[PDB]
Structures are given as C-alpha cells and as structure tokens.
Design a protein around this ligand. Structure first.
Ligand code: SF4
Ligand code: SF4
Ligand code: FES
Ligand SMILES: [Mg+2]
Ligand SMILES: [Zn+2]
Lengths: 208, 86, 115, 690, 109, 96, 125, 48
C-alpha cells in the first residue's frame, strides 16, 4: 500500500475535526453542517444569512485568524431548488490552515456582499454576478467584469450553450463589427464517455 | 344538412359518461341497424369529459357535451343530430 | 409568505416607480448618446428603440424579476454614459445586418424545417 | 409473508424464495459482474465472473445460479470476491486477442469495462495465444471467433428465443469452439440479436462494420415502423447520418429484441430517395421543380374537382398527423374517398368499434393464455416479436398452440388443423375435436391475421372467427377482462387510419373512379392507371421512388420515419411517437406540413400551424392518439358480434395461404426494405446458400 | 502435444451429406432395443450407443452417419455433432483396421 | 493506381471525384487537386504470401515495438490465406 | 422581511436566451435507455433533459457537419423527474416527459434446465 | 546523411518540394468521401 497510494495524516484530520466542532459550537445560529474530507480539508455549510457573521468571526477571532481570502466562486447545480452554491476559501497564516465555507442561493435571492470583511472579494463577487447572475446586495460597484459589453446571459450556467448564441464579424456595408446568430461550419461533437459499470462502490447511492 | 360521420367520445370509467356507456351497451346496435352506411365512431375519452361530434358536408363539424346525461338524453340528442332538427 | 425576500422593492408599485426612473434616465441619455457616438440615427429612432426594449419585458409580474431587469438596465446605461461601449455595441440593438426572418407558414415551409 | 430476510453487506433485504444472490444484490443497487448470465436466457454458470463471498463460508458461490438462503450475508466487496474477480478476468484475458483498435466492440465492450473496473492492470501471461478460424453464418452477423470467451449466450438465445438449434460447441478443453460444425447459414427473423447479446466482438454487425465508434453516436429513441409490432428502438446517428438501429427495452412490446428487418433495413433510407418536387414536362417526363410551382399545380387541379372526384390512398408507413391532415383537406372539398391499401371488412360494425380491429389481449397478455388458435396467418414473418412472445409462452407457460392455414414453420410445435376455412365453421358448430379444447380452457385466445382478411371472403372469415369467440364466451361465461377475440395487423399505418375514420380497402375508389388521386406513400400497386379514367391527375407524396412514383403527375418529397416526430398506433392499439434523428434530405419536408401548405395554397387553409396544434386535432378526432403509452380500451365484442350476424356471405373453398410462406419472402415487404441493399444480400443468401 | 485434428467439417467427395450410409436391419433391431432402455419422452439419451453402433458398422463416423442418427432419434443434428466432437472414442476420419492406442500417462510412463 | 475521371479529374484512392455538373470543381481552377499517388491496397497486394510450417502464426508488423500489437493468426483453412488485421500481410501453410 | 410573491416562477427574461429558442423549442425529459450492447446499468440512474434535433447539413468545404442551433449539444442531468419539470417550467420550455422503464423481476431457476416433464429442459450446455 | 544515410523506401519522395503556397501547386482542401444519399432516377419512358 506504500508506493502508489497517497499516505494519510490522522493528526491533521483530528485537529480539523476539533476546530470544526469548535466553530459549530460558537455559531449555532448559522452553521448547518461540518465535514472533513479524506485528504484533510475542512468544510462548513452555513445558512445564507450568516455570510457576514461567520466570515467576520473567522477573520477576527483569536483562534481563527483566517486573514486571507484565497478564492470565492459559485457552482451551478440545476437539479437543486437553490441552484447556486457560493464557496469561500480562507487561509490562516497564524495557524497555517485552510478552511472552506459554503452557502446557497437561487436566481432571485440576493447574497450579502462580503467586501467589508475582505477587500479581495470585490472582484470575485463581480465575477460571480457576471458568470452566474447571482446578485450581491450592498456591493460598492457591481457590474460585468469578464464578458463583452452588452452580453446577454450568464455563460457559466449549465443551461448556457458552449458556443453561446451570437458571434461577431466585420461587415463592410456598415463598416463595423456586428453580432449575428451563431453558425458553425463544424458542430461540436458531443461524446458519451461514461461507462455503464460502477467505478466506486463506496459512493453508491440508495436505490430508492 | 348532409351528415357525413358522427363521433361519440366517451370516457371509460368516469361517472359522467355512465349514461353514455349504457347507450353503447343497450341501443347502439339498433341505431347501427337503422343507419348501416353512416360512420359512428366510438372512441375513448380521457379523464375530462364526454362529448359527441357531428360532421357535415365540406368539413363543417360541431360538438355537444354529454356530461351526466342518461341513455334517454343521449339518444334524444343523437336523433336531433340525425334529423334536420338542430 | 412563501419565504421570499426582496431585492429592493416589496410590491409592484415600487418596482414600477423604479422602472419609470430608469426609463426617464434612458430617455434623457438618448440625445447625448447620439451626439457622442456619432450615430446615423435620429433621437426619435433611439427613443423608440428604448421604448421597444422596455416593452419587451412588459409581461413580467414578479417584483424581483422587475428589480433585476432594472438593475441590468442601470448597468447598461452606466456602460453607455461612460463610453465603455463602442458604436458597434450601441448599434447591435438595431440588427441592421441581419436579414429579416419571415413569420408566415408558407415562407418557413419554403426555406426549411424550422417552425 | 413468504419473503425471507437476507443481508447484502449487512443490509436487510426481503426477497421471495428462489431469488438468486445476483437478484438480491441488485435489489439494493449492486450489479454483480457477469459475462454469461442474461436475465432473459437460461442460467449457464460457466463464465464464473459472478463469484461472490458469503459470510462464514470458505467457498465463493456463483451469484447467477445460487438461490439465497435465510440469514445469508452477501459480501460483494470483500477481499475474497475481489480476488476471485481478478483471477477470472486474468483467465479471460489470457488468450484474448490484442484486437481492440480493430474491434468494433471498442468502446462498448463488457470485457473492456469489467477489466477496467474489476480486473488487474498488468499481465503475467508469458506464452503464445490461441487462434481460432472464423465461421461464416451469413451476411448479417460477422464472426471473428478468436474474440469468443465461450459464454454460450448465442447458443442459448438460438435454442430458446429463436427456436433454432444450429449453434453449439465442438471439441473440449481449451480448443472448444462455438459454431455450427458445418458451413451453414444462421437465418432467422431474429438472428441479429445475437450481435447484441454477445459481450465481445466475436459476433458483430456486418453492415455496420468499421463505420462508427460508440462515443461518437448520438442516440435518438424512436419507434420501428417496419411492422405493426411497434418495437421501441434507438437510432444512433453521427454528423447527421443514421449509423445503426438498436433495440430499446420495452417489457410489454419487444422485450429486448428487434426483428432483422428492423435492424438491417435502415440503409434503404439512402438508396432511392425523393429529394425535390417533380412535375411532368411537355414530353411527359418527370423533371425537377420548385415547391411553389408543384404546390400551385396540385392546388389548381384540386380546386377544379370536388366531392367524389377526389380520392386518396394511404400507404403502409404513413403517420397519424399526415392521415388527419389529408382527411381534413379532402373533407374541405367534400370528399370521403379516403382509403387504405390494406383491406378490413366494413360489414356490421366495421371500423365503428375499435375492439373490432385490435389485438385486444395485447402482446403481454399472451403470457397468460392457456390456448391460442391462429387463423390464416404466419406470425413468424408478419409479426416476429409477437411470434417470439408466443414461443416464450409455449416454452415457459406450456401454452397450447393450434393453426388453421398452411403448415408453416413457427419454430415451435403446434397442432395443425388444416388450411380449409370450413374448419372454422366446424369449430363454431362444435363438431370439431378442437372446439372442446377451447371450452375447457380458462383463458383462450383466437388470433386472426389481417392478411387472411385481404382475400375475397374476408368478411365471412371474420364472421366465423367472431362466432367461435362468442361461443367460447357464452359457454365458459365471462372470465373477466380477458378479451378472447384478436386481430393481428402487419401494417404500421393501418390502425391509426382506422381510428381516424379512413375507409379500409380500395373498393370505394374502384366503385367510383376519381379524377384526382392522392397517393400518400401508396406503393402497393393496388390501383394503376388502367383502373382509373384517362387524364387522371395522380399526386404521389412519399420518401422513396418505388412502384407508385413513376405513374404520378406531381411528386412531393416527404420525410421518412427517422426524419419526423410522428405518431403510429400499435396492432394492440398503443399510440407511440417517433423522434427526429436527422432532417429530411434535400427539399423533402414533413408530410403534414406539405398537406397544410397545399391547403393554404388552394384556399382551404387548415386550422393548425404547428405539431402541437395538429396533435390537438388528432385528439379532437380520436382521443387515444395522444395517450402515448396507454393500451387499455373498451370491450364492445357483443355489439360487433350482433352486427356481424346480419350478413350471411358465403365462405370460399380456397385454402388459406399467407403471403409470406418462407424466409425469402420476409425481407422485402415495403419500399424501404425493397430499396435496402442488405436485404437483397439476405434474399440472395437464402435463395442460394453457397 | 496438441489436438492435431480439426473440429469443423468441410465437404469432401469421401465425406459429405450424400455419402451413402444406412443401418442394417439387424442394426435397426439393436437400435430399437437400445431405445427401449430409456424412459419414454427422453430419446436423446440414446445418441451415445446408437452413434457408437454406427461407428461399429462403418468403421468411422461420416457426416451422413451423424445425420442419420439425428434423423432416427429425432434430435437436431447440431447436438449429434456436439456429441461426436466431444468424445474421443468417435472417429470422424477413417482409421486403420487395427487401431492401436498406447497409454503414455505417468504410471505407464 | 490513379485513374482519370471522364471529366479529366484524378480519382483518389478513396474513389472520390466530382461529377461533370458539380460546381465544386471550380476550387481546382488555376490550382491543382491533391492526390496521393501510392495506393495502399495495390501496394499491399504486391507482397508475396508467407509459407510457414505451423497451424498458428504470429504477426507484429515488423520492427518489434515499432510495429502494431502482436496478434495470432490461425491457418487451418486450406482455401484461403490468413491475413493480419493490422498489416495486411498474408500467411499460409504448405499445400499442394 | 418577506414580501410573499404568489406568482409562477419565470426567469425567462433574465437568461438572455433569444425568444426563438424559448417558444419554439421542445425538450424531452427521460431516463436514457440502457445501451443494448452492454449489460451495465450505471447510465440509467439519472434523468436527462435534452432538446429537439434541428437541421445539420454538409459544409461546402471539407464536407463537415454544420449546424445553426446553439442547443444541439445541451444535455442536463437531474436526480428526480420533478426537478427536471421544475427547471423546464421556470425556464419557459415546453416539455414532454417519459416515465421510467424498469426491467421486471425475473424468475430464474438453474434446475429448470433439466426438467423431467416440462418444456424448459435444455438440449445443450 | 553522407555517413548515416536514411532507410530507403519505395514510397519516399525521390524529389523534395519546398513550400508551394501562393503558386499554382498549392494544396486545395476537399471532401474525400463519396455521396451519402442516392436520389431516385425517374424512368426515361413516358407514362401515358
Ligand atoms: S472484444 Fe473487447 S476486449 Fe476483445 S478485442 Fe474487441 S474491444 Fe478488445
Ligand atoms: S460468440 Fe459471443 S455470445 Fe457466443 S459464446 Fe462466444 S462470446 Fe459468448
Ligand atoms: S455470470 Fe455467473 S457464472 Fe457467468
Ligand atoms: Mg457483440
Ligand atoms: Zn501484421
């Protein structure tokens, strides 16, 4: 089991479980779940109303001191009633640790902006709004960041087609760049790669 | 005026078609004896409503509801459709 | 109460008032847009385009959707005023190059298979 | 209850006695590896891939053949089970050929997948591999026997499902080979299914060879229209071209199988295709034309005549939407001469009551009957999956089968009563020995083929069969909702046309010949220009150039069943809908769209513009045409039987001979299969085996 | 070493379905007695002796002999082919008048 | 093994050639059509059949690890040679 | 505080999809059928939502397969049928739903291969 | 290649060619596959 298998670290697992219990105890009002993965990553699932408190705690508590916001992003899962999942990755330099905070929202429910807690969030939230259409309340300047001016739709959503809806070309009659409905000389070839046999028995779901 | 075909759309188990069902199982045959050349299409309705269709020359057709009718009511409306009486 | 929280407006009246504010701002901005971008259209043409764009979403009855539409329209106006957009972006609202697609049954049948 | 408690990995499951370890494991979502076990075949137990560990038992057991005991704990993922799987896969791969890049089973191999999920990743086999010569079993199934793993699935399928005992094993030990031991063709109307059951590339499809890979294909779930069975199928396309047809599992219609005509006649959709509208020029020859001018010509000719002067004949592959559109279009002209080439008697009830022309017992109900009487039909070629269901009930339920007609080979032994129709009357009379047999039966079934109704005395035959069914119902009483009387259709478009009110048969047109004739895919040759007045305007609308197209004045190219979302009704009355896999070639258009455009040009615009609206019209005419999996219906046998007694037409002293008498007649029945080059090869191979 | 012989049949002037083979009337009496040994409704159980009987009359087993046995016992010919190719006492190729078999297994080795 | 179309166009080894009425030939005006001159079917047909003294032969295409995956060919049929499924080389046993 | 919207959910005006690809599109909600070439059933667990097939033609250059509809390759995965229906309704697409087809429980018996009097006795193994 | 010559093959070009872009010898792409669907051919004889 030695050469080709990634080794385990039970000490970090125990420490992360203890700190997850600690955070859940201190903030019962917003914490809904705590997990530690098999590769020692701590995850905290919270109610959407606790974004500002929990993060503030994790930034300012003497035992947390998660001063750095490494990354903030969203995940689109259409089968869920709350379509969008907001993920915050935080780094603590004092204790040399990383934590993850996850909440949820849908297309119409705004999420409170965390610019006051972390300045770094300012662009990330913008990007989320650009790519998924999640509105952030009380954002100092919330606008598109990555897409073209006047772009309609949110590309990172699962129902958004890969090639989009419009394409650009220069037209000499009007002497300018114009947008037209997308047309492809070669259509993208969809591949069915999934095997009809189960791969991981440990992740099997109840058959209802 | 010129009738071409008639359709009875009756729902199989709903109570509102019960009388219509009775018609089909009591006095449809006699009617088919009386009109041996008139298409009388018996078709099965959904859970919604029973009704009767009547088609005339040049594709004009009209429908009448048969909900909660009786055997007497359905033969009365059928004979009204058959004759030049509404 | 359906457990839904607002963005800005709590009923249709506040959403309508925000719509009217945005419409006023766009109507005021149109002549400045025509002058700055050096567009070959009249002020009346641009204002009719604004009216059409506003009426395209006239069927909405959800205050949250109206709120998000007003927010997107505000971003569009802020893009236009600051000259972040270019003449190409502004003129994409008119589809001058696109050939009009016929709407009656016979033309669709003659050209192809699309309904 | 009778259920016993077992444990799968410590989880409690309640199962009926006789359940095997494999079924108990799959009751909790665990699929045991398998190669030789198929749930529709007899248990083999030879591949040994399914070996699983039972707690407190030193020996692993074959899950596919081992009934679960009370209190057993099945350990599907213990070290013993994993080691058994690895060893069995090692043995399987020891002599397997390094053929994956040139094998058509490439991305679809159970051997490959179960090696990746349950086997090892290396090889310690340091010897030379074995090689086996190939066997030729016909043009449909390509054989490369080096890839065979000797699971004997094909042998069991042939012996049980197909009723053909030509496949077997010769030799023993390592040099044991699956074949026929002689140069013999494996001809069966269900012979192609052995390609699907074979887990490896030992048996593959010859027409499909080397053309596509499974990951490239886009799968469209559709309905087969080559018979009235309505088998659920998958059309696999790639870059807008049909690659192959596969079975789609429907437990009540086709189970897991399709017919050879269903599987291998798709290439006929690329051979003689109508792509552009055509008209006659000054020289009397067909020449290409725009849609506008052809539609204007047809509309101008339609505006002139009216009433009885306009008639239409529907073909065998016509959808319900096109049928209703044509019905409406001809009704606006005040015409009622809407006919089908297939003949169904109109005396008494005729098409007035649905159960008069349906398979009322349904296909799944065959597995409940204790006796079945077949009259004037060859179910093997008319409805191969219906015959497969009959064979399955004959094998498992000990079903008793009798036939009146030509003594054809049905792949199962039956009691042959003869081919004289008078025998039917004798059975009704009670003089015949078989009549008693029907009386003792709890669930008798009588099936009358629509092919016997094509002859002159079809009404008399139907009356006699109804008399037999009524005698059974009167003697034995009403068992319940059993529906003794049945009609077996062979045309995919017939039942929908009868539901919509089309007149069965052509006799209405022969009685009053028309001036304008619509041939909606009518390629049967029932009506020619000798039976019509001269200067008759014939309009053909279809997808193939066949016997009906050259005799037309205007040709309108239509879509095939793979190119539209269309509704077809089963022989048991079940409505189903196809899906678009590819668009029609060239200028070809959807049929109902063609009829609606023609109506708009001619001035009598139809009230529907989209598919949803035309299906709403379908519901208005016959509500059962929008219930897309329902098969339940009413029993109006009493009224039809009473109305069939008022006509006393005499029977004919002519023996019943089905149109399909041997396998050679099976391959080409409609325009698509006649245009298919694979069916030409099948006919040539059957006529001369060489 | 290896098997050497082949388990497929190819037609040949000396071995084909039209090759003349039939049972002698006394061999038919023997076949009747053999068939009488097994329960009614199980006649395939007689393929092993009857086939062997053919090999005793003819000296080997042509394809016509297998076909005749299958026709007599009303079994599919493929089953008779399987029996003939499975068992090594059956000669699917002509042999000499005196067929010499030498045991070479470990006790005799 | 190139042949000439009735219109004068070279025919590729796949057999493709535009018809007389096909406008797509205009792309070759003032330019050329690219046709590979070495036909693999004709080239592989020239190879002599290898006589071997065994029922089963092995083929890897030559070059060891520089060829194709090693496969084993049965040579029990006397009316037809054994063909490699990768390389096309033919093998047979001594007959006659 | 909450505002109690009692309307039907409709995000059509926010997705930026052209109105052609909202009103004239028909989606299919279904559990995909098992590939008949393999016995594995792992690809028949989830629900799929797909769009109606549109026209594909041949490229005048190189003969490739050209399309004109952006939803040709859009396939969505859902855990239950109700989730797929809710997604389709809130996106404004008209849908057709096919019920799940599950194989019936079979009655297998190895000993049946050797019946004394029944028809299920096999002739070879 | 004077001291270590390459292997000789019958299909190897005996005459090297430079980049021929912009000359009449330039490569022009085309579809190498045959026609997919064959159309019905009407009879040459009149029907009436
Ligand atoms: S059958 Fe499967 S494992 Fe065998 S060569 Fe073909 S793809 Fe490979
Ligand atoms: S040919 Fe295929 S199905 Fe038949 S025994 Fe061999 S591997 Fe099994
Ligand atoms: S699946 Fe059980 S032994 Fe083959
Ligand atoms: Mg296979
Ligand atoms: Zn080779």
């Amino acid at each position: 089991t030695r050469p080709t298998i990634r080794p385990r670290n039970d000490v970090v697992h125990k420490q992360l479980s203890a700190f997850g219990q600690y955070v859940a105890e201190i903030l019962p009002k917003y914490v809904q779940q705590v997990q530690v993965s098999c590769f020692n990553e701590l995850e905290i699932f919270i109610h959407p109303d606790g974004v500002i408190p929990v993060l503030t705690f994790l930034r300012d508590h003497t035992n947390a001191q998660f001063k750095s916001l490494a990354d903030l992003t969203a995940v689109d899962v259409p089968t869920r009633q709350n379509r969008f999942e907001i993920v915050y990755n935080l780094l603590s330099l004092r204790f040399n640790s990383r934590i993850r905070v996850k909440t949820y929202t849908d297309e119409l429910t705004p999420i409170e902006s965390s610019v006051t807690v972390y300045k770094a969030a300012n662009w990330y939230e913008r990007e989320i709004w650009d790519m998924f259409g999640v509105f952030f309340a009380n954002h100092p300047d919330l606008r598109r960041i990555l897409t073209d001016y006047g772009f309609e739709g949110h590309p990172f959503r699962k129902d958004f087609p890969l090639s989009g809806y419009v394409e650009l070309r220069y037209d000499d009659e009007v002497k300018r760049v114009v947008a037209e409905p997308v047309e492809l000389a070669q259509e993208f070839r969809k591949f069915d790669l999934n095997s009809p046999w189960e791969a991981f028995p440990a992740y099997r779901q109840p058959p209802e | 005026l010129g009738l071409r075909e008639i359709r009875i759309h009756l729902c199989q188990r709903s109570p509102g078609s019960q009388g219509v069902r009775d018609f089909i199982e009591k006095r449809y045959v006699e009617l088919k004896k009386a009109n041996p050349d008139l298409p009388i299409l018996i078709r099965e309705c959904s859970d919604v409503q029973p009704k009767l269709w009547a088609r005339y020359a040049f594709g004009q057709e009209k429908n009448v509801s048969l909900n909660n009718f009786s055997a007497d009511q359905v033969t009365r409306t059928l004979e009204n459709v058959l004759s030049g009486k509404a | 109460g359906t457990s839904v929280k607002p963005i800005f407006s709590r009923d249709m009246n506040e959403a309508k008032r925000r719509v009217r504010e945005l419409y006023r701002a766009w109507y005021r901005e149109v002549p400045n847009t025509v002058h700055l971008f050096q567009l070959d259209i009249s002020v009346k043409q641009g204002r009719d385009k604004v009216r059409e764009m506003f009426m395209k979403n006239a069927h909405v009855t959800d205050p949250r959707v109206v709120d998000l539409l007003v927010i997107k329209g505000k971003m569009e106006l802020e893009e236009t005023i600051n000259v972040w957009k270019q003449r190409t972006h502004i003129m994409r609202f008119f589809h001058e190059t696109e050939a009009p697609r016929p709407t009656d049954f016979l033309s669709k049948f003659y050209v192809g298979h699309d309904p | 209850s009778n259920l016993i408690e077992v444990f799968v990995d410590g989880q409690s499951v309640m199962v009926e006695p006789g359940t095997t370890v494999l079924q108990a494991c799959e009751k909790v979502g665990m699929q045991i590896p398998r190669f030789c076990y198929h749930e529709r075949l007899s248990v083999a137990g030879n591949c040994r891939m399914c070996l699983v560990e039972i707690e407190k038992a030193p020996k692993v057991v074959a899950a596919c053949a081992m009934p679960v005991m009370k209190g057993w704990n099945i350990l599907t993922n213990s070290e013993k089970s994993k080691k058994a799987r690895e060893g069995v896969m090692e043995f399987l791969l020891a002599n397997h050929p390094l053929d994956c890049p040139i094998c058509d089973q490439g991305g679809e191999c159970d051997l490959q997948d179960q090696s990746m999920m349950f086997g090892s990743d290396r090889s310690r086999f340091l010897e030379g591999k074995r090689a086996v010569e190939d066997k030729n079993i016909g043009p449909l199934v390509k054989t490369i026997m080096t890839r065979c793993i000797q699971c004997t699935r094909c042998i069991r399928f042939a012996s049980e499902i197909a009723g053909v005992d030509d496949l077997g094993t010769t030799g023993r030990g390592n040099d044991m080979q699956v074949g026929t031991y002689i140069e013999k063709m494996f001809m069966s109307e269900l012979s192609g299914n052995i390609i699907d059951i074979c887990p490896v590339g030992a048996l593959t499809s010859k027409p499909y060879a080397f053309t596509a890979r499974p990951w490239e294909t886009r799968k469209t779930e559709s309905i087969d229209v080559m018979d009235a069975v309505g088998s659920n199928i998958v059309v696999s396309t790639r870059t807008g071209e049909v690659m192959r047809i596969l079975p789609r599992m429907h437990e009540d219609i086709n189970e897991e199988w399709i017919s050879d005509k269903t599987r291998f006649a798709y290439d006929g959709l690329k051979r003689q295709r109508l792509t552009q509208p055509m008209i006659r020029n000054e020289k009397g020859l067909l020449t290409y034309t725009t849609w506008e001018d052809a539609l204007s010509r047809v509309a101008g000719m339609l505006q002139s005549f009216q009433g009885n002067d306009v008639a239409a004949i529907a073909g065998g592959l016509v959808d319900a939407e096109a049928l209703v559109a044509l019905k409406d279009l001809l009704n606006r002209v005040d015409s009622d001469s809407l006919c089908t080439e297939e003949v169904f008697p109109t005396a008494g009830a005729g098409t007035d009551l649905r159960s008069n022309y349906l398979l009322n017992t349904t296909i799944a109900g065959v597995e409940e009957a204790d006796v079945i009487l077949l009259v004037g039909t060859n179910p093997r070629f008319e409805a191969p999956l219906f015959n497969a269901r009959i064979r399955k009930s004959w094998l498992h339920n000990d079903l008793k089968v009798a036939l009146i007609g030509s003594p054809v080979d049905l792949t199962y032994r039956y009691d042959h009563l003869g081919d004289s129709p008078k025998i039917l009357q004798d059975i009704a009379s009670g003089n015949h020995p078989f009549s008693q047999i029907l009386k003792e039966a709890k669930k008798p079934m009588v099936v009358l083929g629509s092919s016997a109704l094509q002859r002159s005395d079809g009404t008399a035959i139907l009356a006699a069969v109804s008399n037999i069914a009524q005698n059974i119902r009167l003697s034995s009483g009403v068992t319940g909702d059993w529906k003794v009387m049945n009609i077996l259709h062979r045309i995919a478009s017939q039942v929908a046309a009868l539901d919509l009110g089309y007149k069965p048969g052509v006799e209405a047109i022969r009685k009053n010949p028309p001036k304008v004739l619509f041939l909606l895919g009518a390629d049967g040759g029932c009506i020619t220009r000798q039976d019509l007045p001269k200067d008759c305007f014939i309009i053909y609308q279809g997808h193939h150039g066949d016997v009906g197209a050259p005799m037309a004045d205007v040709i309108l190219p239509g879509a095939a069943y793979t190119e539209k979302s269309a509704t077809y009704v089963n022989t048991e009355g079940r409505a189903q809908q196809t899906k678009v896999a590819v668009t029609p070639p060239g200028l070809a258009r959807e049929d109902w769209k063609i009829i609606r455009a023609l109506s708009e040009i001619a001035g009598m615009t139809l009230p529907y513009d989209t598919l949803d609206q035309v299906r709403s019209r379908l519901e208005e005419v016959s509500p059962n045409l929008v219930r897309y999996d329902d098969v339940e219906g009413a029993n109006y046998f009493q009224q039809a039987n009473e109305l069939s007694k008022l006509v006393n037409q005499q029977l004919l002293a002519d023996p019943l001979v089905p149109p399909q008498l041997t396998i050679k007649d099976f391959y080409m029945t409609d325009s698509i299969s006649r245009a298919s080059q694979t069916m030409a090869k099948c006919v040539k191979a059957v006529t001369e085996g060489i | 070493g290896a098997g050497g012989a082949l388990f497929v049949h190819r037609d040949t002037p000396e071995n084909n379905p039209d090759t003349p083979f039939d049972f002698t009337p006394e061999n038919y009496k023997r076949i009747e007695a053999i068939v009488k040994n097994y329960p009614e409704g199980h006649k395939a159980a007689a393929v092993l002796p009857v086939l062997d009987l053919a090999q005793r009359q003819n000296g080997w087993l042509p394809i016509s002999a297998m076909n005749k046995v299958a026709e007599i016992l009303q079994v599919p010919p493929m089953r008779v082919y399987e029996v003939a190719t499975f068992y090594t006492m059956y000669n699917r190729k002509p042999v000499g008048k005196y067929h010499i078999q030498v045991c070479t297994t470990t006790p005799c080795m | 093994g190139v042949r000439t179309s009735p219109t004068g166009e070279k025919v590729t080894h796949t057999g493709q050639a535009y018809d007389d009425g096909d406008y797509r030939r205009v792309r070759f005006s003032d330019r050329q059509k690219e046709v590979n001159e070495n036909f693999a079917i004709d080239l592989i047909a020239e190879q002599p059949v290898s006589e071997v003294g065994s029922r089963v032969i092995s083929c890897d295409g030559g070059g060891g690890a520089l060829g194709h995956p090693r496969v084993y060919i049965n040579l029990d049929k006397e009316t037809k040679t054994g063909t490699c499924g990768y390389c096309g080389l033919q093998f047979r046993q001594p007959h006659h | 505080q909450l505002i109690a919207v009692d309307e039907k959910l409709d995000i059509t005006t926010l997705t930026g999809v052209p109105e052609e690809h909202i009103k004239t599109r028909k989606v299919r909600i279904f559990v995909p059928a098992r590939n008949n070439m393999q016995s594995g059933v792992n690809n028949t667990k989830k629900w799929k939502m797909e769009f109606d097939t549109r026209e594909r033609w041949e490229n005048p250059l190189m003969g490739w397969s050209s399309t004109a509809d952006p939803l040709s390759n859009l396939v969505l995965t859902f855990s239950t049928k109700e989730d797929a229906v809710a997604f389709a309704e809130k996106n404004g697409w008209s849908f057709d739903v096919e019920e799940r087809k599950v194989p019936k429980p079979k009655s297998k018996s190895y000993g049946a291969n050797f019946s004394w009097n029944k028809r299920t006795r096999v002739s070879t193994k | 290649p004077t001291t270590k010559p390459p292997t000789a093959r019958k299909y190897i070009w005996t005459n090297h060619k430079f980049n021929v872009s912009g000359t009449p010898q330039q490569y022009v792409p085309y579809s190498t596959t045959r026609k997919k669907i064959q159309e019905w051919v009407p009879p040459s004889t009149p029907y009436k």
